[PDB]
Design a protein around this ligand. Sequence first.
Ligand SMILES: Nc1ncc2ncn([C@@H]3O[C@@H]4COP(=O)(O)O[C@H]4[C@H]3O)c2n1
Ligand SMILES: Nc1ncc2ncn([C@@H]3O[C@@H]4COP(=O)(O)O[C@H]4[C@H]3O)c2n1
Ligand SMILES: Nc1ncc2ncn([C@@H]3O[C@@H]4COP(=O)(O)O[C@H]4[C@H]3O)c2n1
Ligand SMILES: Nc1ncc2ncn([C@@H]3O[C@@H]4COP(=O)(O)O[C@H]4[C@H]3O)c2n1
Lengths: 201, 201, 201, 201
Amino acid sequence: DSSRRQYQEKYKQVEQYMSFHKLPADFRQKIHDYYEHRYQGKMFDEDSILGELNGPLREEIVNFNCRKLVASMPLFANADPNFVTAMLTKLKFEVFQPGDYIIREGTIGKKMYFIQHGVVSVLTKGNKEMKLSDGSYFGEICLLTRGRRTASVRADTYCRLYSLSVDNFNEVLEEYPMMRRAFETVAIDRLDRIGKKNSIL
Amino acid sequence: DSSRRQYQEKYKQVEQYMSFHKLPADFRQKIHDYYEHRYQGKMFDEDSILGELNGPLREEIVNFNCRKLVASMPLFANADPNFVTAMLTKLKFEVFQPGDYIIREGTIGKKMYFIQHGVVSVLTKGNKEMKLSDGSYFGEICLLTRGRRTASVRADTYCRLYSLSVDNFNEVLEEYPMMRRAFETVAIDRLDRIGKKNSIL
Amino acid sequence: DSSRRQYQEKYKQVEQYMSFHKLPADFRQKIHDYYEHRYQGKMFDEDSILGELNGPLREEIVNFNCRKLVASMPLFANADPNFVTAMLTKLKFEVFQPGDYIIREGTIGKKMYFIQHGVVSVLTKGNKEMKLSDGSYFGEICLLTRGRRTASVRADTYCRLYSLSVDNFNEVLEEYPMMRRAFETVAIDRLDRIGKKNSIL
Amino acid sequence: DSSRRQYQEKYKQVEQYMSFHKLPADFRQKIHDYYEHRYQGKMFDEDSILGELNGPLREEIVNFNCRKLVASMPLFANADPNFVTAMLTKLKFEVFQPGDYIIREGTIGKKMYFIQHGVVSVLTKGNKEMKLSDGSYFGEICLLTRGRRTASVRADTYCRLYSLSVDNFNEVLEEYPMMRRAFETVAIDRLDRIGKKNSIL
Ligand SMILES: Nc1ncc2ncn([C@@H]3O[C@@H]4COP(=O)(O)O[C@H]4[C@H]3O)c2n1
Ligand SMILES: Nc1ncc2ncn([C@@H]3O[C@@H]4COP(=O)(O)O[C@H]4[C@H]3O)c2n1
Ligand SMILES: Nc1ncc2ncn([C@@H]3O[C@@H]4COP(=O)(O)O[C@H]4[C@H]3O)c2n1
Ligand SMILES: Nc1ncc2ncn([C@@H]3O[C@@H]4COP(=O)(O)O[C@H]4[C@H]3O)c2n1
């Protein structure tokens, strides 16, 4: 009701904004498609909503909502549930469209991404062309080294992702420094298979 | 009027959110029950409201609202009224349900809690099983030592609590360092009766 | 229209809040009176409003609104108009009721106050009983020394004041350190006539 | 619809605010004119709007909206598109009226300005009287030296500008320190032709 009415009303304002700025018809369609995928006809102020509840219910809700994400990703599946919960409560849902460059090589990285659904392509000068899909994550290397991105990552399909900011990543690893090692091992494995070696891990 | 209408409208959005995420019927009931207890059919933007007033009226209102809390808790009852007021204006009302773990042992603590109404259980590896009830507080030990929580605390009944963040606790003790001692003495007493000794107090 | 309707609607929510907390009839009247004095039947989101404009119009508006304040107070009347403007744009309007203690001796001070209209009483252990009225200011001593308040200040009548936070005071004196001296001289004069001497000025 | 209704409604609140403060008729007209120029009958919460989208669409939208600004200004036209995008996403649209002093000499500078449309006059004690117009920028010297403004800049016509804060300027030059040199060269050229020499560039 108010959730479906909010979607319509908010989308209307998007239409008037695009009209005001005279965006072309293809660009408008693209934005429309993204809106459909990202919100699916409803809008919630999830912040305000979760902010009315308490810690325990928020945590119970986030665990319920991400059951498949958690169970399909060994890093989350085998870890301390308190660590899992601390990660989940800071994740932000994002949708990307095919061809979008989620991450650009060389740039400075402020987030990593957990793939709920979709396929992306890790691209590099080298020619290394590796896919990643449901149950994996990426963008973690630059958060561990605080270097620049080691590759570009491009959306092949529509991608439903959950992002985690560099600040929250670090706040979580402060409390659970055990799990930093689990990220570094895979990060090393991955760099290894694109002729890279970082002494920082 | 607008306060009762706000509750209904806000709860409706909660229902649509739960529906959207397909939460089970028991979880929905649990969230409904919490809402009833936490808001009791009305919603106020207490922030905005208090922000329209001045310092003196805010302080007069918070003292009126917490008269029983203040008078039933010797730490507040016997102290400097300016200290009391400074604590009260920073307290945040929270409701917990039976079985909820308000605090987990070993974790890092960012708040303590004053019990307006309810019973909680301080749980520890040891086997020490102590209850606390109306007029007491907990969660203070980790704010004084900045260690990890010394025990878990679990709600036995519905609990009406007022929380105080670690930042506000410290801002208040900066202005009134006299009262830090009053927290440390009880903290020592409590650690003593669970075979703990911290040299930090 | 929407400004008068906002006042009514906002006051209604205040009434429901007071009712919810069961405040006594005298306290309710007091809050009602304050509301009348503070808002005079209208409410504006002056922030949002001024935020739609630019720097030059904001500055022109604040100067227009405070013409009598500026012209009646020699510190503002004789100074650099850019300094005046920088002070004015950071001032916050506040109303106090008779008997209110605006400032308490011994406490830590985070603001000073410019009197638009009203009489206050500077009170001290000593017995020094000095009035201040339209065109003067107070609360500046603790901002210059960062000590504790040197006296208590109490509202004799309804007081229309403009407050300035310690952060903004300092940001303004950074840009115009010339004017710090003008505050210190009066501050010294005032301390002198209550048997105080601070070497910090 | 809601965008045109928002403009009207917001302007109405401006009228009631001006009425409340008893602004004169000329000042009211001036504010009305600014509103027309600045919003052109529509209001969007561009923040909220762009915040519903993702990084790639925001970036695509900002590039589309500023095509003429980017293509007419060699600094942007010939640079790395990622640098351009990083600048554009932080720019804030502002409108100034004829006679307005956008920048005052001697003051401390917290922003620079890119001229979308309009003519301004760089004024100095000296007597140097230089115009700048569509496709140029100003206010950059104080951001590079962190001194005081080297001149005053005054609007000759209505000016459509995009401002960039000192914090964002620096965050962008951190990532692309190559382009600081491009600002310094012009800054030196400009100081040279008003008998100034700063060793800081
Ligand atoms: N699967 C795979 N293989 C080799 C790789 N080299 C880099 N990456 C991912 O691309 C990412 C590019 O961003 P980042 O360097 O922050 O983290 C990098 C890794 O997640 C790789 N991913
Ligand atoms: N009553 C009681 N007795 C022994 C205790 N040992 C610890 N606590 C409380 O449990 C709390 C667990 O969180 P914390 O360690 O921050 O503060 C601790 C105390 O408030 C105790 N409370
Ligand atoms: N008029 C007057 N005379 C002696 C005073 N001694 C202190 N004050 C004011 O009371 C104020 C109490 O707060 P503060 O010490 O921050 O600044 C102090 C002065 O403005 C005095 N005001
Ligand atoms: N065109 C031109 N010529 C000489 C100049 N000397 C200073 N400026 C501009 O005026 C500006 C005044 O603000 P700022 O000193 O921060 O940057 C300065 C320059 O953009 C000048 N602009």
